[model samples]
Every structure is written in C-alpha cells, then in structure tokens.
Target: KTVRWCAVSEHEATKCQSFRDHMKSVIPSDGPSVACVKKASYLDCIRAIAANEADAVTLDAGLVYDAYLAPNNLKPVVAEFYGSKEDPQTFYYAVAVVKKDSGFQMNQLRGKKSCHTGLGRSAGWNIPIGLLYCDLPEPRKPLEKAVANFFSGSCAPCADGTDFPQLCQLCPGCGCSTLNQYFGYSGAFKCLKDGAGDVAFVKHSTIFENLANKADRDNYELLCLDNTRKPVDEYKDCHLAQVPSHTVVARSMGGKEDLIWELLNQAQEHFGKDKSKEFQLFSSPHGKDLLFKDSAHGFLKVPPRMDAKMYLGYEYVTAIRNLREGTCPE
Candidate 1:
C-alpha cells in the first residue's frame, strides 16, 4: 500500500517530494510507500481525494467543514496542535482585536472599518460574522454582500473583486484576495496597527506573535462575544471562538486513517521539532505553515468516530450553521 499526499503549491509539492525521499530510510521495508500529488488548490486536493486520485492533504480547520460536505465526504484523520507539547491543546481561540481606546463594543461593529484574516476562514470570517450578523432577519444577499452592508469598509483577502468593491476599498494592491497587503493573521493585525481599520479579526495568538512587549500588547484588547472588553493576555477566557487546528483529511470510507497516522508519526519521530535539522515536519525554509502548521509540535490521530462535525465541536458547528442559515435555532 502507498500514501499519496496532496500538495496545493509547487513549494508544498517540493516539500512532499523530499518527504517521500526521506521516508526511504524511515519506513519499514514492507511499510506503506509515499507518493506526492499536486493540485491547484485545497479544493482541488479535496476533490482529488474524493476520486481516490490523492490520499491526504493538510488544511485549515475552517475548510474541514467544506471538505465534509456532499460529493467530498472527507474525514479529518490527523490533527496538528500549537504551543508547548507539555500542555498541548488541539484548539486555538479566534478574537476580535481593537485599540484600547476604540470605545466601540461588539454590538456596535456596524459601519466600522475592519480587518480579517481571510475570506470564509473560520477564525476570521465565519466566527465573527456568525455571532454578529445572525440577527439579520430574512437576509437577501450572499454572506459577502451582507458583510459589506454591516461594515462601511473592510479587507477580506481572497474575496470577490467586482462583486464587493467596498470590502476591498481599504486594502493595498490586489485587495480582493490573499495577494492584498492585509491578509492572514499578521496582515490583518497590521491593518489595524497601521490605523487603516478599527478592528482586526484574527486569532488569540496573533497579538503575542506580533508584539513582544506587554506595553505594546496593552494597547490592544479583545472584544468578547458578550460585548465586554478584556486584556490581550486574558484571551483564554475572552475571545470569539475556539478553532480546531489544521488537519489531514481523506475519504471517509477508505481514508486509511491509521496508515496516514503511521507515516506522519514516523515522520515526526524522525524530523519533528528539534529532533533533527536534516528535515522538519513543521518548518519550511521558504514558507510558514507549508505542509503543516509551522508552530505545531506533533500530530494527533483523530478517533475514527470523530467526523467533521465532531472534529469542529458543537459551538463552532452551531455558529457556522447560524452563519449559513441566518437562523440561530439550537
């Protein structure tokens, strides 16, 4: 048997190629062989897995729900975690950050300039919008249009250019997609830091990753779901939502979860953090989060029973459902 890992970019493909090569000595003589498959996008990778053309690919937790939908039917087989391995947790918090003097509360987000990690990403777009916009009665537009109506101007990298011009108005060049200057966690935080946006929708770790000193972090605060403000260091209790880390997915039926775990476990055993500089499971020379999350310490073999809904947890699933259905029942 063989494990075909899917890659979305040439860089990732190269990394996967090296992984396959490195496994020549790592795997047992009769163990699963390694292969690399390149796709145009994460969506393409999901499609290829469904068709059995590809076996597995690591992806953002937000997209896991999308991969679980009809025709795809993928399952999250392996999970990656961040922070200290001693007390490692498989989840992180999504938070809305603002300058301490912004004075606006969570309920008053309307018409404010905003910064977001990426379009439709769980922490950035899905969670905040789900909480804030669920009250829009009988909404009449796509989530993008509704968002535009709620905020005067915002930057959602990887958004539609022509359809939502206002959303891209505050962004730098190529504002409608990840090519914009305000994309991802640091980018969105930078948008707010540079005074271009009133709030930045990112994750709990963002503030710490960007600001090294307590004074600089003190200038920022998190907008809790209850419309209260909390210190940046208190994000454990005050944040938008808890998000599952990036994951590896395969077909739910014949996904070969254990086999993938074996390969990943072996890879981590040999190349995981600080183990060896020859190759690293979570570090990339040219990019961050290349194949897996850069800061991740190891991989967890998700229980076979834990499908997409179980993996994403109840509150997050409910929130995402609320975002799509525009109703908050249950």
Candidate 2:
C-alpha cells in the first residue's frame, strides 16, 4: 500500500516533479511507495485527510488550531524546527515589516497600506490583529471593519467579498480568494516589494528568504511595539511575538502515524540541509519555502504524548481563539 501525502500544488512543473522524486527516494524501491497528492488549498487538503482521501498535510499553527475543533480531529505528528544549533524550537516569530525609509513607527500603523499572508494565518492575520484590537475602545467591532478603517488599503487573501471588500482592495489579481496571485508569505512580500503596501505582516524569515540582495534587505525594517523599529535580522530581540511554526498533521483516527514518521525521517536524512544539494527538502525555486520553511534545518518529532492544543501551548492557542472571536463570526 502507498502512503499518500497531501501537498499544495505548484506552478512550475519541474519543481513539483522534484518533490515527488525526492519523496520516492526516501525509501528503497522495494519498500512502500510514497504518493504526493496535490490539492487546491491547505483547507481542502485538511478536509481530504479527515475523509481518508489523503493521509497527511503540512498546516500552519492557526489552521492546526481549527483542525483540532469539533468537525476535524487531526493532530500534529511532526514540527518544523527553526533557529540556530544552540537555540532550536518548533516556533518562530511573527513580525510586521516596512521599508526602512518609510518613516513609520509601530504606533503610526493606522491609515497606512498593508499586506498580509492570508486570513486566519498566525503571522499574517491572527497575531497582528489580536495585538491591535486588545486596546481598542470598541472591542466588539467587526475585525474587517476595524482593519479596513485602520489601513488605507491592504492585500488580505481569502477574505470574502460581501463582508470585507475593502480588505481585498490592494490585491493584484482578479479577486479576494485564495486563488488570488498575491497570497501566502511570498505573495505578501511581493505586495510590499511592489510598493502596494506600507507594512507587511509575515514570518520573520520571509525578508531574508525572499529579498535577494543586501541593498534590498537594507531597505526594510521591522515594526516594534516600543514605538521603535529594527532591522530584519534582529527579529529575535525585536519582534511582534513568537508563534508556533507549521506542522505535519494526520487524522486523529486510523492515522498511519508510525509510517508517516518513518517516511519523513528518512526523507530528511537524505535531503535536509547539508545532506543533499541536488534537491532541498525545505526550499523552492518559484516561491519562498513552497513546501516548507526554507530556514527549517530539520523536522522535530512531536512528542508522541502531545495533542494539537497541548503541542501548540496555551498562550499561542489563546491568541488564535481571541483573534477568531474578533475577526470571524461566532
């Protein structure tokens, strides 16, 4: 029997094929073959896993929080690790970045153009909005209304047209759906690169992975809550907040957890950083970290004893729940 893995589809044919080839090479030809099933969106892939149509998929922390709720019963099996050899964990920082010369501090974010990874994403939407709304006088105000009023315009992907049209105002493509060209970490950075937004909410590593040259890197700065700003590389000391990184999740019931880990463990051994140069397990040519975060050095096995909520920790999970209360309808 084949172990089917769900992955987000890519625009480039070669890159997708390489992903399949890399997976196939994980185990010897005599062992079970690995199947890579491409899905339209991360949510679709998650649903497929629940229905047993797919076995596993990579999911953001916010989505993992949602998956653990009533309808879906998926749990985290593996976590992507970030940071140096001395300091490694299944977490990274969510940061807001602006052009260094933009002359804007954290306090002056209102009425400025903005870019976001997508709706419901930790760095892009949840954490930033959660922090912003905590001090607002009218806390019960609709999140879209609050954000639309604060930012002059923004490119927030996956936002519904009927309820939040203004949030989609800065998107470059046809509409506000996930299918829009400017979505996700890379797309959000591109929005900032094109001068479409004054601020971009994304993972801390985004600028380093996406911006090619030092000159381009020097043009940007991180927005700090102390009414100050710092360069991109200083995110550890000066960031919005630390949030959980992406995870490989499987259905809580009847999941082949053992087999999945075996496959991933072998794959990482063969393709992880410094292991192979022909193909990288955590990189993409067309976008910033297409399959996984480019900065990820290796995968950490989620404690076999932990469930999604426990693995994600109380504070991080609370941030998502709090953000949903403000942004999504109850």
Candidate 3:
C-alpha cells in the first residue's frame, strides 16, 4: 500500500506531510504509504511518468501542454483540484510584485525585463509571456516564435550571458523602446528586490502570500486580471498546459483500483483543512487553469461552454501542442 505522487516544487512535495496530517485527523493507517518527489521540472516529471519513476505527476496547467507535446508520454488516471473553505475562489495566474509606485498599465510593461519561475513553465513562462506579449503589443509571437525570440536576441545576453542584458536595460534602466524583454528566474521574489527586472509573473493565491510571509520586501503590490479583462482573450491561442491535479494512477487497476481511489480521495479530503494551508500544500485538478483564468484581470472571455472533463487537465496538452504546431482548433 504505497503510492508515489510527483509534485513540482519543494513546497508542493509536502503532500506527504499533508497525507500524514490528514491521516491522523481522519483515520490513521487508512492512508496509503504516499511518497512525493518535489522540485522536478515539468519535463523531468513527465519523463519520470514515462519511465515509471513516478506513478502520477502533479503539474500546473501550462506544464501539461509541454508534457503532452513532448515526444513520448504516459497517461493520467485521477484528477482532483484541492479547494478549501467549501469552494473558495478557483486558481489563476497573476503578474506579481510590480514596481511599488509605478502605477503602470499592462501595455506599458512591454519591452521591459520581467522574470518568471522557469522557461517553458506555464504560469512562470506562458502566463506572463502571454500577458506581456498580448497586452503590450500587437505583433504576436506564437510558441515557436516565442521560443525563438526568447532564445534568440529577444531575451538574450546582457553583460552576463546567464541573464538577458537587453531586456535588463529596457525596464527602469532608461531604454525608451517598448521592446519585449524576457528573462527567467528560479526565485522571482529576489528578482524583484535586487532590481533584476520591472515585474515577474506569479500565482496570485500562492506567490503573493509567500512573499508576504517572508515579509522581506512589502512595498510592491499584487494585481489580478480576470475573465472580464480584454487582454487575455484577444490572443489567438495559448500553449498554456492543463493544471495538473493531485492524482492516483493505478498500474494494476483491478484489485487495487478501489483502494487507490480511496487514498486519493482521502488526500483531497484532508487537504481541505487548516494544516495543509500553511505549508502551501495544494491539490488541484484544473486548478492552475482556473487560477490563470481568474488572474488575467477580466482579460479572458467566457467560452460558449467550458468542458472541464474535456478541456481541463492533460487534454489541454494536446490542444496547446496543436495550436503550437498550427493544427489545433484555436
């Protein structure tokens, strides 16, 4: 009775801790022997799933696009988005830690150096980049073009090759051009304070509080964009991945199926409590999508009908990849 779940971050890996905490509260020993591997990149997690290194991989909505588009892959079994307070607001991406008093508009943010969690990351990469690309200018960069621009001169070489010097100069450093600057950050909070760039994209629910918790630099503010906003919906397509859920994938699905579902349900049920909230332990299916949809500041348009079963989770991976390759119904 052991289950291995792959979550993306160290903060996320605490599902094991939550499982323990939940087990104590619910019924001890009823929970599975849950093991979580954290801090894995999206590609690494999917690779693990392909190689059986992990049973299921916890991913953000944007990462699922990358995973599905990746050459080889495994499938998912169960998907559950973690929610607390009896269905609080769903998840979405946010542009966090803007210059304290800039009172900047989204359009003005173009050609400025901005930082995100990683390259090809959904929230960190896709959401911020998309927002910057769509909101600031009309000349669009699809995934292929976006990647090319980022790797080529668009996001390239500051004084240090490790950083984007061109983008660095664009923001507060006196470059007048509304150039689309790009940069990646492993730690976005630091990037804001150290003058790494003008802004960074982050999870509204998670990143804001995380910054507040540190209480290090409290001057910056957090802004949210939602369905009503016009900028996010104007884009032709997005390669944003499906937000991954805390899942239970049973290899041998006959005898252990019921048992696996029970454990996963218990995990979700337990995560609905207080202890899990403090640790940033999150469980979500379509959680990242909702997060992004909400954070766009009224920029996302309500689809005619959103099919959670069809459009949510890993299904979005194929859609995004198709759009990237000029094949999906955008």
Candidate 4:
C-alpha cells in the first residue's frame, strides 16, 4: 500500500522526499510506500488529505482539531512525544513557572509581569487563556484585554503589535517565530530568567532543558492552581493544563490509520534518531521543525477510540472557541 504525506514548504517537501526515498530501501521496493506531496500551508495540506491527494500530515493540536472538524473529518493516527524515549504518556504540561523566592501566587496574576510561549499556541495561549478566563473573577471585557490589564507587562510574542502593547512590552523583538528572543517556551522562560517577567508560561520541561545544573533548577518552581509552589519536577501535579503533543492525522473515513502507522512504525525503527546513519525521521538540518519537530523523541499510534475531540479535551476546545468570541463565556 502507498501513503502520501503532505508538507507545506520547500524545506519540508525535500525532507519528505528523503524520508520517502530512504524509506524505500529499508523495506525494499513493493513494501509500504511513502510519497511526498506539496501544499502551500497546513490549511492547504488538510484540504489535500480530505480530497485523498495526500494520505497524512502532522499538525499541532489546534490544527489537528481543526482538520478533524473539516468536512471529511480526519483523525489522528500517530503522535509525537518529547522529554523521554520510554515515557508512557503522550502529553506534556502547560505550567506557570517562577522563581521560588517570589511571593506571587497562581490564582492572583494581577499586575504581575508575565511571559507566554506565544499567541494562539496551545499550552501558552489557548489552554492557559481559557483557564485564566474562567478562573479569574468574571471578566468584564475580552479575554486578551482581560489578560492585558491583568498583567503589569508581558511578552506574549505573536500577540505583539496588536491592540495590547503591554503583552509585547518586555519582549526585545515581538515576532511570531523562535528568531524572536522571547518567542517560545524557552524564550518566554528566558524572559523570566532575565528578570523582565515575574512568571513564565511554558511546558513542564522548559526549565530543566535549559538549566541542566540542579542548582539553577532549584531556583525555579511551579505555580499551581491551588495557590502554591512546588519543585520543578512536580509538573505532573502542578501544571496549568495537560495536553498531547503534535499529532499525525489521516482521513477518518478512509481507514488510513494502519497504512500511515505502518510507514511511520518502520521509520520510527529505521530512521529514528541514533538508530540509522542513513537519514533522520525527526530532524532537519537546513531548517528547524520541518516534517516533524526537531525536538520530537518518537511516534506512538493513538488508539482508534481516541478522535480529535477525545484527544484534545472539549474544555480546551471551548477555550479555542472563546479565544475568538468576546462575551457570554461558560
């Protein structure tokens, strides 16, 4: 059987080609085939899969949910996990991190300088913002504005140059991508470490990844919803939200999961990091985050029972919906 994977850019297209071509040798000709398909964007990528021109593609949780809601109703077949290779969980946490010495509590974000992964990002924007909207005493205004006024200053990159300048105040470069110093999990955390922000909204592993020394790691702690602080390793119990990583999705009605997983399972064994010298399944040297995340550890096929809504909770889903609407939130 043949499976076509979609890529949105030239860099990704070439990487896909390498995976496809290199994949052939691992299984030999007439084995499962991986073909690369080019599309302009994730939206276009989703469209191609819907029409059957492409069989699969990987997307962040938001786009995964969006693609699943598309007319043809795609579903995630496989998922990417970071942190540890043997980690049983397919999810990561969105936690509020701060210096242990700071007295500020989680429930009270008012007037505190804050940092976020980026606007519209899952753990950074969508999930945390929803909790903030519902968690805060009734919001009299839009969520972003409520957030804008709540923080004394912030660096929610990509939200920059919008109506709220406060969100962009601490950031040296208010950009949409990682090139901006304060644009990602580590970037947002960097702002906190630089003393520009009181709290940094990032995933669980951000601090440990950057600060290898246990001494520096001890300098930070998690801000839990219960208005308490815990050691950085306590993310499982102290996170703002627990959500899955990027997902590899395929057509729901087509029953393309097995075909996609076959190609992926083989790649995971042969091309996965340190396993083969021929090519990389989860890396791109010329560019970062090409076909899959450069940071990804491996892929795990999601059970057939888990669809998009089941995988990414409806609470998070409602949060995304409210991210656009202004009032009357539940």
Best by lDDT: 1
**What TM-score goes with each of the models?**
0.85, 0.91, 0.56, 0.76
Q: Write the per-residue lDDT of candidate 2 for residues 202-304, one digit (tens) a residue.
A: 9888888877898889989998889788989899877888888798898887888877787777777888777788787777666555656678888878888
Off by over 4 Å in 2: 12-16, 84-87, 172-180, 327-330
lDDT of residue 119 for candidate 1: 74
**Candidate 1 lDDT by residue in tens digits, 86-201:** 98889888899999988999989888999987776778788888776656663643688888888898888767657887678678432432335576777789899999999999
Local accuracy of candidate 3 as per-residue lDDT tens digits, 156-182: 211122333443332323121112123
Deviation (Å) of 36 in candidate 1 = 3.5
Instruction: Please say which candidate is ahead in lDDT: 1 or 3.
Output: 1
Better of 1 and 2 by TM-score: 2
The candidates, ranked best first by TM-score, are: 2, 1, 4, 3
Deviation of model 1 at 189, angstroms? 2.9
Candidate 4, backbone clash total: 0
The models' CA-based lDDT, in order, is 0.81, 0.78, 0.42, 0.79
Among all candidates shown, the one with the greatest TM-score? 2
Report how far off residue 323 is in candidate 1 (Å).
Answer: 1.7
Query: What is the lDDT ranking, best to worst?
Result: 1, 4, 2, 3
Error of 3 at 190 (Å): 3.9
